[PDB]
Design a protein around this ligand. Structure first.
Ligand SMILES: *[C@@H]1O[C@H](CO)[C@@H](O[C@@H]2O[C@H](CO)[C@@H](O)[C@H](O)[C@H]2NC(C)=O)[C@H](O)[C@H]1NC(C)=O
Ligand SMILES: *[C@@H]1O[C@H](CO[C@@H]2O[C@@H](C)[C@@H](O)[C@@H](O)[C@@H]2O)[C@@H](O)[C@H](O)[C@H]1NC(C)=O
Ligand code: CL
Ligand code: ZN
Length: 607
């Protein structure tokens, strides 16, 4: 470690911690920057040499973390948590968690290489027919979104899960062991316990389970209504009205958002078409327009525009030179208070416009907290970070807003149009909830050893069936590693944040809508141009992780806890409608034929 980056001496006291945190921040930006930069260079241009550079950068970060971590423990391990300065306690608490820097050098290098190889496998996996091969984004994504051929959907689903998941399994086992070895040295029973600790709630798992109990009936009704729609297209051979839905038929590789099958389920087809994708295409929208439109919503609230560095540095389309890249959308803070970027293989669709807002929400958070101490440059919890852009996107997707931006000519305000809109939003928001909940239940079980390698797939599918009510369309066994075919697993990005965000965003939306002076139905609120809503949101953003999330939330929405009631209020009309429709249609709610799997197509896979 460069002498300039090494820790000096400080008194074994609070006033010493302060000068310590200051000296840390002075070097930590440089170390954070070099790491993020090396990661960027790799993720926008996956080469062996870029992976090598990224591993060396990670090693340097671990040296830094070890040196500053050991020093924090040297001076404070017996005494440290009684500091009067709460922000200083949070800074120190973070510095002293070494994580993978607890590993001896050889195991650090093993750990860093496993992360690089898992990233490479996921982001370069292909499905091959011909000598021609399909990438996940855009090719397989487009098949899942727009093919209605059971056999073709099956080819893409099986192809992807086999190509990504199978080779990842042995690496993921090794990663899990090393990760646990690392975090056990910080005092945590396993890595999952460390991830859950970010929510600073002793009742976190119970609180989540109680939220889900309130949400589950909404999902069960949406599921039954959708299953019926699919039965009408695919027939009795491929859809069991009392069994799980085949996992490839819901518009999305993970069945996690069902927005792409909106045309099959839309209750009132003769009302305005709320999927504006075809209008974006007809109008000639490109990625640049989508980002500028998202930016203008932020500036309408008197939040910050995207800086020149963002426009100059970002990767907003998949490179056309055919470079391998990580296409999964992400937002980047380089920790130098200047560089902030999005890396997105943007496609011209309505859902992608939502994703642009999601990512830009991350960037806005970064811009607003850039001057806090580097340890406090995080969301009040990770769920807050995931919610910011989604909240704006709730206003953007309203038929009233879409009209304002030239994407929906017809204006209607009637009960059928409301049901259509709420059903569309339910396909995006309600359909996700079981998935958002289950992914880290799976991973917490892996980290804890409740799910050893011999049960990775068995337990994955148990949870997928339990929560989502889906089944794999071909037989799976433990050679398969279907959890690994979801970005966040090989890229070691925690998932519970998304479940938390999907609840939180409605709490935020309700609060901002009230602040805006809006007095109509919550689902028709548009906060566009509300500088009062902007100011309330800015308060959250500027806090970073400097204060307890429960207090930040209380200041914002008037309650110190996650609460499903705003989500339930938002969806109330369609919740009631779906329940009525399912009863009238004689549906079974749930999937009591839990063993059921669809047959294979007759000529599969030939053709
Ligand atoms: C992608 O990464 C590679 C390195 O892994 C870059 O290749 C280097 O490019 C620089 C500047 O053009 C050269 O001077 C080196 O000789 C190159 N090294 C190798 C190993 O080829 C490549 O330029 C990067 N491409 C993009 C588009 O950023
Ligand atoms: C796991 O499954 C692998 C391939 O799937 C199998 O063959 C396809 C065509 C289907 O018939 C499917 O039902 C079968 O499971 C096998 O190559 C592999 O042997 C299986 N793993 C173990 C340990 O048996
Ligand atoms: Cl999280
Ligand atoms: Zn995000």
């Amino acid at each position: 470690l460069d002498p300039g980056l090494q820790p000096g001496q400080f008194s074994a006291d609070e006033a010493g911690a302060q000068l310590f945190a200051q000296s840390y921040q002075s070097s930590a930006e440089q170390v954070l920057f070099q790491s993020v930069a090396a990661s960027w260079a790799h993720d926008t241009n996956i080469t062996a040499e870029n992976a090598r550079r990224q591993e060396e950068a990670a090693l340097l970060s671990q040296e830094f973390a070890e040196a500053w971590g050991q020093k924090a423990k040297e001076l404070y391990e017996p005494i440290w948590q009684q500091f009067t300065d709460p922000q200083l306690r949070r800074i120190i608490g973070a510095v002293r968690t070494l994580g993978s820097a607890n590993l001896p050098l050889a195991k650090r290098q093993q750990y860093n290489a496993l992360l690089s190889q898992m990233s490479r496998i996921y982001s370069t996996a292909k499905v091959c027919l011909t000598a021609t091969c399909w990438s996940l984004d855009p090719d397989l994504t487009n098949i899942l979104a727009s093919s209605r051929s059971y056999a073709m959907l099956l080819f893409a689903w099986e192809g992807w899960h086999n190509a990504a998941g199978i080779p990842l399994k042995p690496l993921y086992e090794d990663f899990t062991a090393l990760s646990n070895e690392a975090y056990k040295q910080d005092g945590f029973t396993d890595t999952g316990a460390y991830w859950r600790s970010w929510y600073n709630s002793p009742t976190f798992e119970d609180d989540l389970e109680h939220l889900y109990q309130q949400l589950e009936p909404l999902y069960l009704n949406l599921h039954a209504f959708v299953r019926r729609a699919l039965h009408r297209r695919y027939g009795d051979r491929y859809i069991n009205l009392r069994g799980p839905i085949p996992a490839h038929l819901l518009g999305d590789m993970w069945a996690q958002s069902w927005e792409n099958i909106y045309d099959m389920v839309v209750p009132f087809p003769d009302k305005p078409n709320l999927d504006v994708t075809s209008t974006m295409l007809q109008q000639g929208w490109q990625a640049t327009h989508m980002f500028r439109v998202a930016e203008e919503f932020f500036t309408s609230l008197e939040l910050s525009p995207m800086p020149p560095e963002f426009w100059e540095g970002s990767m907003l389309e998949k490179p056309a030179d055919g470079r391998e890249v990580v296409c999964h959308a992400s937002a980047w803070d380089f920790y130098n208070r200047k560089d902030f970027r999005i890396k997105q293989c943007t496609r011209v669709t309505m859902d992608q416009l939502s994703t642009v807002h999601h990512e830009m929400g991350h960037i806005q958070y970064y811009l607003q907290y850039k001057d806090l101490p580097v340890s406090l440059r995080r969301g009040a919890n990770p769920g807050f970070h995931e919610a910011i852009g989604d909240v704006l996107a709730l206003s953007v997707s309203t038929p009233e807003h879409l009209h304002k931006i030239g994407l929906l000519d017809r204006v209607t305000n009637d009960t059928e149009s409301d049901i259509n809109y709420l059903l569309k939003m339910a396909l995006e928001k309600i359909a996700f909830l079981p998935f958002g909940y289950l992914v880290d239940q799976w991973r917490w079980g892996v980290f804890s050893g409740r799910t050893p390698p011999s049960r990775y797939n068995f337990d994955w599918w148990y949870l997928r069936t339990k929560y989502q009510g889906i089944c794999p369309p071909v037989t799976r066994n433990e050679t398969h590693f279907d959890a690994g075919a979801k970005f966040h697993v090989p890229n070691v990005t925690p998932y519970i944040r998304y479940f938390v965000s999907f609840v939180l965003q409605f709490q935020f939306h309700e609060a901002l809508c009230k602040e805006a002076g809006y007095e109509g139905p919550l689902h028709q609120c548009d906060i566009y141009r509300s500088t009062k809503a902007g100011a309330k949101l800015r308060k959250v953003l500027r806090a970073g992780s400097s204060r307890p999330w429960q207090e930040v939330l209380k200041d914002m929405v008037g309650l110190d806890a996650l609460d499903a009631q705003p989500l339930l209020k938002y969806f109330q009309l369609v919740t009631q409608w779906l329940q009525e429709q399912n009863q009238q249609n004689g549906e079974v709610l749930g999937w009591p034929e839990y063993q059921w799997h669809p047959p294979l197509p007759d000529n599969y896979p030939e053709g």
